[PDB]
């Protein structure tokens, strides 16, 4: 049939029990795309905002990692100019032992705790590391502008 | 064959390698010579980031080439 049984099972398990604070539903055109909405973590500079993301499962999943990008503008040191995020695996690599849900929880965690020293946006990460308070306030401002509707 | 690895601090390291050696085997040679675990290092040749699985011939690294050890992600 259409999609490999692992993608079908992961999709149904995600829908049956969502990740708290994360809506994740497959696209109806192509079930390898997921529309994701992550709520700004409590006590983080993105608190209050809702952030939309696209999650794509390449043909070689699960041997290739998913591809995730933000569809909502965000002032984050680990999101790049096109909204893409790196999955941030230090001193290890992606493997089929990992799942879509682990990816979703990791994105939620990187909202809750940016990592300036593994940056995709060098300028944002620099401003995050020298003037942390300034970058936090900028993040709150962009949450106001683009993430609260 | 013999290759060189340079650091930002000016240091040059000499390694005996074969062309079928992977980039990971090269990193382990650097570890044996400098005490830097393979995970804490990247390699560069001709401005390209090398991947652990690929081989020296996969990148056309020939004798006496100079790679650069990168110690910041």
């Amino acid at each position: 049939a259409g999609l490999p049984r692992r993608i079908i099972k992961e999709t149904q398990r995600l829908l049956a029990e969502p990740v708290p604070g994360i809506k994740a539903e497959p696209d109806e055109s192509n079930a390898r795309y997921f529309h994701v909405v992550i709520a700004g973590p409590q006590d983080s500079p993105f608190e209050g905002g809702t952030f939309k993301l696209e999650l794509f499962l390449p043909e070689e999943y699960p041997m290739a990692a998913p591809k995730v990008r933000f569809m909502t503008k965000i002032y984050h040191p680990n999101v790049d100019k096109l909204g893409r995020i790196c999955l941030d695996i230090l001193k290890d690599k992606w493997s089929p032992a990992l799942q879509i849900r682990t990816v979703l929880l990791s994105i939620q965690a990187l909202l809750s705790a940016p990592n300036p020293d593994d940056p995709l946006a060098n300028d944002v990460a620099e401003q995050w590391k020298t003037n942390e308070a300034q970058a936090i306030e900028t993040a709150r401002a962009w949450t106001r502008l683009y993430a609260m509707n | 064959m013999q290759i060189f690895v340079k650091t930002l601090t000016g240091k040059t390291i000499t390694l005996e390698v074969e062309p079928s050696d992977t980039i990971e085997n090269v990193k382990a040679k650097i570890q044996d010579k400098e005490g830097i675990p393979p995970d804490q290092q990247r390699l560069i040749f001709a401005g390209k980031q090398l991947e652990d699985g690929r081989t020296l011939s996969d990148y056309n690294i020939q004798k006496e080439s100079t790679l650069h050890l990168v110690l910041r992600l």
Binding site: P96, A97 | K6, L8
Partner: protein
């Protein structure tokens, strides 16, 4: 209010200078750094384009790679060793062999209990390895399989053999006879590469292919001991200065961590002092658990508590960063001559003082601007 020991003064000076001066602690002139980075960056420049603008684009992009201190945990341990030992004794220390930390860490503790706290200054260097087993199974015809050219770190299923080629190229027959291999070869489909760590096939097998891959994973697990999957992963040091009188022995951990922080960030965060407060016995005990546990959460928690950037312990080894493979802790120990270490630190401070500027920030900025100007100039020279 007596004076601290010379050995403790090494720690205080190393910590203070590293906080203040950062990248300057290497003692390498800024010009060297800029020229080396120019040599790294010259391929990225298109020689038919705008040369001035490509150079300024490259210089402003790779600035941090140049003027920030290293994140390599290995390079940080090397820096510490060279400050405290000097070049010659640090080379001798490096060719000393690593010992494995025992299951409860009593071999390290025993070394520590046979040196009097008042008599010596100890430097311990640790290396953590992680298991990196093969994850791919390749089903191939015998006629297409030549062990000399096959990709390394894979398991190979032929019509009549089951082989593992490790990271270094060693060929291991895994042991099943020809009929078993015929069974496995023909139970599996035609995709060529299959996963050995896919939980949906290993835990929810639904077709014979899943059961065959599962049998292969079991055959491999049952003889894991024949192989060496270890790859060097983390590095750090612990300094134990002499005490005076009946004062109890303190230890201080130093590290950098790739993609996470520098030795300078480590000192600025005082995580060295924080971990110091738990005591060397507790520290060694949890190191030993780390190297011995089979539980992923326990492994991840100890690793995060000990090696994370301060303030990130809750996320450092979570989710995608869970520590799902066994770890191995190794150590080597040497004595420190505190006089020599203090001389290396003072010589580094003399180097730092040759830089114009009033406060440490100003000398650091001199150093960085010099590196950027030397890189711009060396690129201009390489492009003629």
């Amino acid at each position: 209010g007596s004076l601290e020991s010379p050995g403790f003064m090494v720690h205080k000076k190393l910590k203070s200078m590293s906080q203040s001066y950062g990248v300057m602690m290497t003692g390498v002139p800024a010009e060297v750094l800029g020229q080396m980075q120019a040599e790294r960056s010259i391929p990225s420049i298109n020689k038919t384009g705008n040369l001035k603008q490509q150079i300024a684009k490259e210089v402003s992009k790779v600035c941090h790679m140049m003027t920030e201190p290293t994140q390599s945990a290995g390079q940080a341990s090397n820096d510490v060793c060279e400050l405290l030992l000097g070049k010659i004794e640090a080379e001798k220390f490096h060719f000393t062999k690593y010992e494995a930390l025992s299951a409860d860490g009593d071999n390290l503790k025993n070394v520590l209990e046979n040196t009097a706290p008042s008599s010596t200054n100890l430097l311990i260097r640790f290396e953590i390895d992680r298991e990196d087993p093969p994850i791919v199974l390749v089903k191939t015809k015998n006629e297409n399989f030549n062990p000399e050219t096959a990709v390394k770190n894979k398991i190979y299923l032929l019509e009549n053999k089951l082989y593992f080629i490790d990271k270094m190229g060693n060929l291991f027959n895994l042991g099943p006879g020809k009929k078993k291999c015929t069974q496995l070869f023909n139970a599996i489909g035609d995709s060529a590469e299959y996963s050995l760590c896919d939980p949906f096939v290993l835990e929810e097998p639904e077709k014979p292919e899943d059961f065959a891959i599962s049998e292969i994973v079991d055959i491999f697990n049952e003889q894991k001991e024949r192989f060496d999957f270890w790859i060097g992963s983390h590095s750090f040091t612990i300094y134990i200065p002499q005490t005076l009188g009946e004062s109890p022995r303190q230890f201080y951990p130093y590290q950098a961590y790739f993609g996470s922080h520098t030795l300078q960030d480590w000192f600025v965060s005082d995580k060295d002092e924080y971990l110091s407060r738990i005591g060397i016995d507790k520290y060694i005990e949890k190191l030993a658990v780390l190297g011995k546990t089979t539980n992923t959460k326990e492994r991840s928690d100890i690793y995060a508590e000990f090696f994370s950037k301060r303030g990130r312990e809750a996320f450092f080894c979570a989710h995608l960063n869970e520590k799902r493979q066994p770890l191995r802790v190794k150590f080597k120990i040497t004595e420190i001559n505190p006089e020599l270490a203090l001389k290396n630190l003072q010589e580094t401070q003399e180097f730092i003082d040759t830089h114009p500027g009033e406060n440490p920030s100003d000398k650091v900025e001199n150093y960085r601007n010099r590196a950027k100007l030397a890189m711009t100039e060396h690129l201009e020279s390489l492009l003629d």
